[PDB]
Write an enzyme that holds these catalytic residues in place. Structure first.
Site, short mmCIF file in Angstrom:
data_model
loop_
_atom_site.label_atom_id
_atom_site.label_comp_id
_atom_site.label_asym_id
_atom_site.label_seq_id
_atom_site.Cartn_x
_atom_site.Cartn_y
_atom_site.Cartn_z
N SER A 61 2.41 43.67 -28.83
CA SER A 61 2.59 42.28 -29.25
C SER A 61 3.69 41.99 -30.26
CB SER A 61 1.27 41.72 -29.77
OG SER A 61 0.37 41.59 -28.68
N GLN A 117 -5.23 37.39 -21.54
CA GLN A 117 -4.50 38.17 -20.57
C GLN A 117 -4.32 37.43 -19.24
OE1 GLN A 117 -7.90 39.55 -21.68
NE2 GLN A 117 -7.53 41.78 -21.77
N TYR A 147 -5.12 32.98 -29.64
CA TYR A 147 -4.08 33.97 -29.36
C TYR A 147 -4.07 34.36 -27.90
CZ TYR A 147 -1.28 38.22 -30.13
OH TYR A 147 -0.36 39.23 -30.15
N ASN A 149 -1.58 36.06 -24.41
CA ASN A 149 -0.36 36.54 -23.76
C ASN A 149 0.10 35.56 -22.67
OD1 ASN A 149 -0.43 38.91 -25.26
ND2 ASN A 149 -1.33 40.13 -23.62
N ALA A 299 0.02 46.13 -30.25
CA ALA A 299 -0.62 47.28 -29.67
C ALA A 299 -0.51 47.27 -28.16
CB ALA A 299 -2.11 47.31 -30.08
N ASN A 324 -3.33 53.57 -30.82
CA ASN A 324 -3.73 52.21 -31.22
C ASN A 324 -4.90 52.41 -32.20
OD1 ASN A 324 -4.59 49.53 -31.44
ND2 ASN A 324 -5.09 49.28 -29.26
#
Length: 342
Positions: A61, A117, A147, A149, A299, A324
């Site tokens: 990220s 995701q 948050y 992606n 990560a 991670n």
């Protein structure tokens, strides 16, 4: 390096590597505008390859800070506006829920709950269009931050359409090259594979898998030297020759929303120096504040990274590991190191 830096870094990171069982790690501290590097362990356990200043780590990220700056550069070029509706760049997004959702919302995770995701089932261009058309927001745009992606990832893909360049080509041409990040890649070339560290998840060596919008949300691989350079650029954008890149960097650090003590920029997140969340809009956005703790954690299945810097102190740090491990441990170490040098 000054003994003060050498000491605080080693005294902080060695214990960390021990407690978290991190195979390899690289750290760069930018003190008064100069970088100092440190490396430990292995980039590849089986082949006993050590971590070096040339080792490539998956940034996860932290890649979003690059997307955010490329977006800011496109704004500086007058190719897009954050106030533009998402449909202006993707006419095919006709579903009614998209009315009122702007590029700013996508870039700052406030579109109304886009998922973290993009489903693994989404491969083609049409599959992706379908994913976004069928998505039902839980909230009105600009009210809550989640948050995701699929949110900043879309912002990245749309922000480069006017340029006509692919995302990777636009990043290379407008961000990597001008900043001399000659060892930062979206796709690792065969020539750099000898330097590409393996990530470790449950003791197994792994590299990030390909996915939709991966380049835009979590796909940059870089060395500790290039990341230090990325940090120096972000600490002093005024020293950047390319006018639009300089502005793009400043734009990515502006404060668009506030959730608690944190402010959301484009990719970067900030706090004054020294999970669905309701957000307050900062109207108009506050231009980058020098007295800030600017950072981003990142990560992938096998890597963990962290970047944090304080403009008014010309101080910054980058931590790259091929495991991670818990974010609090990253931030804790970063704070011990910078507080000491602060």
């Amino acid at each position: 390096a000054p003994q003060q830096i050498n000491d605080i870094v080693h005294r902080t990171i060695t214990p960390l590597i021990e407690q978290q069982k991190i195979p390899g790690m690289a750290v760069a501290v930018i003190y008064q505008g100069k970088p100092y590097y440190f490396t430990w362990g292995y980039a590849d356990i089986a082949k006993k390859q050590p971590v070096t200043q040339q080792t490539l780590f998956e940034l996860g990220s932290v890649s979003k800070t690059f997307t955010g700056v490329l977006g800011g550069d496109a704004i500086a070029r007058g190719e897009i506006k954050l106030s533009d509706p998402t449909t202006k760049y993707w006419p095919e997004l006709t579903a009614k829920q998209w009315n009122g959702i702007t590029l700013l919302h996508l870039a700052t995770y406030t579109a109304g709950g886009l998922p973290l995701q993009v489903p693994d089932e989404v491969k083609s261009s049409s599959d992706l269009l379908r994913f976004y058309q069928n998505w039902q927001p839980a909230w009105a745009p600009g009210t809550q931050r989640l948050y995701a992606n699929s949110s900043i990832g879309l912002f990245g893909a749309l922000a480069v359409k006017p340029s006509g360049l692919s995302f990777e080509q636009a990043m290379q041409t407008r961000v990597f090259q001008p900043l001399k990040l000659n060892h930062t890649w979206i796709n690792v070339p065969p020539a750099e594979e000898k330097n590409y560290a393996w990530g470790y998840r449950e003791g197994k060596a792994v590299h990030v898998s390909p996915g939709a919008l991966d380049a835009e949300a979590y796909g940059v691989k870089s060395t500790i030297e290039d990341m230090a350079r990325w940090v120096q650029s972000n600490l002093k954008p005024l020293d950047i020759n390319e006018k639009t890149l300089q502005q793009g960097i400043q734009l990515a650090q502006s404060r668009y929303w506030q959730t608690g003590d944190m402010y959301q920029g484009l990719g970067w997140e900030m706090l004054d120096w020294p999970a669905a969340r309701p957000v307050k809009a900062i109207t108009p956005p506050t231009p980058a504040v020098r007295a800030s703790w600017v950072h981003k954690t990142g990560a992938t299945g096998g890597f963990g990274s962290y970047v944090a810097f304080i403009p008014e102190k010309e101080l910054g740090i980058v931590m790259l590991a091929n495991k991670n491990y818990p974010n609090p441990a990253r931030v804790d170490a970063a704070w011990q190191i910078l507080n000491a040098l602060q």
